Structure 1
Amino acid sequence: GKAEDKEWLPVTKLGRLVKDVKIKSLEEIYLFSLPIKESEIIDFFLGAALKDEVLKIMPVQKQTRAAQRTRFKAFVAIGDYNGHVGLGVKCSKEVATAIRGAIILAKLSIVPVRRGYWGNKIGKPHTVPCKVTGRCGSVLVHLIPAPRGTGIVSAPVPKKLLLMAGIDDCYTSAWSCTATLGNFAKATFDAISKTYSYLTPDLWKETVFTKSPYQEFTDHLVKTHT
């Protein structure tokens, strides 16, 4: 037998500071709104808990002189059940590679979701902090806080991203052509993504400004991989 796998020779400055243990968590990446362009940055921090799920396989096709040329579109949702979630979609000629290329995008689009309390703050937030809305081409999704223990009152499809994001209680609503899974899923993901981009009176303390990870580790980047 043989061993010593040496995958993930990085190609970006962030891959270097992630593979080298210099960077601690992807919260430090989100604080600086950097773009994550390598799917191994995710598996470094998360990975032992990220569970993926194939939401739908959808055969699309173009008419052609000879034929109808079909290829399949895979919608995959991913995320550990403790505050991170993502959703990718890839169109490929065969199913087995669409479902594999979609996991890469679902991992690259992982965002942090915010959770809050409904009535009073006893510990371990359980629901969304406020009423949020999200759209994707005539699909509107409304998320509303709920008391503890109510579960997720929603359709099957939003109650597969809402669970993965870490929310225990939620009242949901939709008013649209919700039968198209692509727009339904993208609008739910958008509503979840708008949960950290909502100014709330606890977010009024002035910002303490830290060093960027590229400024703090200039000395490393100068010659850590070459």
Structure 2
Amino acid sequence: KEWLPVTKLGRLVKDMKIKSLEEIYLFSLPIKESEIIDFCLGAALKDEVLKIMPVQKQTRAGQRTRFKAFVAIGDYNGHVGLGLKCSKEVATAIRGAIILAKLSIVPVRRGYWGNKIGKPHTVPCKVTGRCGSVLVRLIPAPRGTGIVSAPVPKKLLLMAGIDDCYTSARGCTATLGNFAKATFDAISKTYSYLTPDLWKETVFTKSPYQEFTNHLMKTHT
């Protein structure tokens, strides 16, 4: 029940030193502890098991069925994650994919169609994402448009907290894994698309490895 943190970044987050996964996402830190993402977005993170998929390794004495569980996770406020865990039975796969979904979560940059007033509703600009044959293009839309998409990328984009969007999809979208991984990859690239807004050169702040080096020596090894 109790979390005893193993990694350096996990130690800081439990000891209250860094308090926003925004600050983690700024220095591009690997997030390997599961409870970090369960700590900052915990009372909002909602789960939808997109698909249970029976795969089969043929052996000497008949097929060996394992189950992939594709789980999209996200608050409805600008964070999604897309976890895929393959295990012996579906209970273990779903649980393991929830954990991998958490560990995957990215921030979504969201912007405006035309009139920059109120809160951002749509994708800032046209972003494309790929996986295998699948290509998921996102285009911004005006307010009240909703997500104009298939049931799979709808479940992600809604969880991303993107209220409005026009999608396109090419290639075998029937392969839900690739189709969910493409639309997740497309979303991911919103804070990896250089807009004019981010032309002002960065005032390089201090890593929580550097900022809180003095705490980390006495608290853990």
Q: TM-score, normalised by structure 2?
A: 0.98
Gaps of 5+ in 1: 1-5
Size of the alignment, in residue pairs?
221
Deviations 1:62-83 (A, max 9, x none): 1111111111110001000000
Give 1:225 shift: 3.5
Give 1:15 shift: 1.2
Residue 158 (structure 2) aligned to one of 148, 160, 163: 163
1:63 counterpart SS class: strand
2-structure distance, mates of 1:211, 1:132: 30
2-structure distance, mates of 1:118, 1:149: 11
**Structure in which a larger fraction of residues adopt strand:** 2
Deviations 1:103-147 (A, max 9, x none): 000000000001101011111000001001010011001100001
Name the % identity. 96
Residue 216 (structure 2) aligned to one of 190, 212, 221: 221
For residue 130 of structure 2, what is the aligned residue in structure 1?
A: 135
2-structure distance, mates of 1:63, 1:225: 47
2-structure distance, mates of 1:118, 1:220: 45
1:188 counterpart SS class: helix
2-structure distance, mates of 1:66, 1:200: 57
Map 1:79-118 → 2, pairs under 5 A:
79-118=74-113
Give 1:18 shift: 0.6
Give 1:154 shift: 0.7
Matching of residue 16 in structure 1 with residue 14 in structure 2:
no
The root-mean-square deviation of aligned C-alpha atoms, in Å, is 0.9
Residue 57 (structure 2) aligned to one of 51, 56, 62: 62
Spell out structure 1 runs of 4+ moving beyond 2 A: none
1:101 counterpart SS class: helix
1:223 counterpart SS class: helix
1-structure distance, mates of 2:201, 2:144: 35
2-structure distance, mates of 1:202, 1:72: 44
Give 1:183 shift: 0.4
